[PDB]
């Protein structure tokens, strides 16, 4: 009817995830994996300010810094929708090309 345990993994590119961090597509990267919590921002104890500033990037450095509970880290497993491209993981050989416009 309206229930389906769909488990998959979509490999997204760095330029794709860092361009979806707006409001209803706010994704965070943890352990080089893409986690969807754009509808859990207000459900996160502490606030969304710390999430929006890490949206579209890897915040694993803060995940281990703060120290999440066992159940907490297990909960994130239900918000996994994909992973980062191998080129953006064990390569990083992709031209950025930016900051060429003076909007100051
Ligand atoms: C994006 C995935 C994340 C999930 C699913 C998540 C989930 C949770 C949950 C369930 C708790 C409370 C449970 C407990 O008692 O341990 C928690 C607490 C907390 N989280 Fe996260 N979190 C995430 C990311 C982050 C990130 C990226 C930061 C930092 C920018 C962060 C900072 C905190 C802090 C500070 C607390 C409270 C600990 C304290 O204030 O001493 N979380 N998180």
Swiss-Prot record:
It is a single-pass membrane protein. It is found in: Endoplasmic reticulum membrane; Microsome membrane. Residues 9-85 form the Cytochrome b5 heme-binding domain. It comes from the Eukaryota. The modification N6-acetyllysine is found at residues 7, 10, 19. Heme binds at residues 44, 68. Cytochrome b5 is a membrane-bound hemoprotein functioning as an electron carrier for several membrane-bound oxygenases. Belongs to the cytochrome b5 family. This is Cytochrome b5. It comes from Oryctolagus cuniculus (Rabbit). The gene is CYB5A. The chain holds residues 1 to 104 of 134 of the full protein.
């Amino acid at each position: 009817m309206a229930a389906q345990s769909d488990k998959d993994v979509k490999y997204y590119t760095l330029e794709e995830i860092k361009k979806h961090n707006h409001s209803k597509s706010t994704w965070l990267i943890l352990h080089h994996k893409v986690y969807d919590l754009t509808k859990f921002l207000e459900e996160h104890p502490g606030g969304e300010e710390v999430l929006r500033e890490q949206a579209g990037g890897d915040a694993t450095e803060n995940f281990e810094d703060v120290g999440h509970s066992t159940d907490a880290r297990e909960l994130s497993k239900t918000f996994i929708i994909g992973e980062l491209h191998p080129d953006d993981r064990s390569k990083l050989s992709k031209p950025m090309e930016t900051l060429i416009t003076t909007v100051d």
